[PDB]
């Protein structure tokens, strides 16, 4: 969801295409597994469980800095 908009920005501005993010399909898969009472956690290298969300301030920081 963020990668597509940032890609359109990059092309329209003549910049390089950015690095891809995480597919929504994988998050949906995890939500379905959880809805099946399967506890599915994404582990990092150290063994801790990563939590998957998105920062709300980025869109607000850019949108607010837009006006000045």
Partner 1 sequence: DEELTARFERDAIPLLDQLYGGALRMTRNPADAEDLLQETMVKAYAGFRSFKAWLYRILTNTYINSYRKKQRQPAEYPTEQITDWQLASNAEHSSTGLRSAEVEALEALPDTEIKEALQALPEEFRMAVYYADVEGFPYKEIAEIMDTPIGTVMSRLHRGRRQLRGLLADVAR
Partner 2 sequence: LDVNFFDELRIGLATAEDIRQWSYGEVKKPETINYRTLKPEKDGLFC
Partner 3 sequence: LVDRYGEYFTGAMGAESIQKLIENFDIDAEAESLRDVIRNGKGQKKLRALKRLKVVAAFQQSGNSPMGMVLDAVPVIPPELRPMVQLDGGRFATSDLNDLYRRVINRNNRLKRLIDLGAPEIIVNNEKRMLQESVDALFDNGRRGRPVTGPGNRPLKSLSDLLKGKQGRFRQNLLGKRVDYSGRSVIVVGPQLKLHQCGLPKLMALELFKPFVMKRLVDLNHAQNIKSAKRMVERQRPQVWDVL
From the list partner 1, partner 3, partner 2, none, pick the one residue 22 interacts with, judged by a Cβ distance below 5 to 8 Å according to partner type: partner 2
Spatial separation of the C-alpha atoms in residues 11 and 52, rounded to whole Å: 27
Per CB under 8 A, the list member of 44, 62, 63, 66 interacting with partner 2 is 44
- By the 10 Å C-beta count (0-12 exposed, 13-18 middle, 19+ buried), 30 is classed as middle
Site residues for partner 1, 4-63, by CB under 8 A, read 4-9, 12, 59, 62-63
CB of 8 to partner 1, least distance (A): 4
């Amino acid at each position: 969801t963020v990668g597509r908009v940032k890609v359109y920005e990059a092309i329209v501005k003549g910049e390089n295409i950015p690095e891809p993010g995480i597919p929504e399909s994988f998050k949906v898969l995890l939500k379905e597994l959880q809805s099946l009472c399967l506890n599915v956690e994404v582990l990092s290298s150290d063994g801790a469980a990563i939590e998957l969300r998105e920062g709300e301030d980025e869109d607000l920081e850019r949108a607010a800095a837009n006006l000045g």
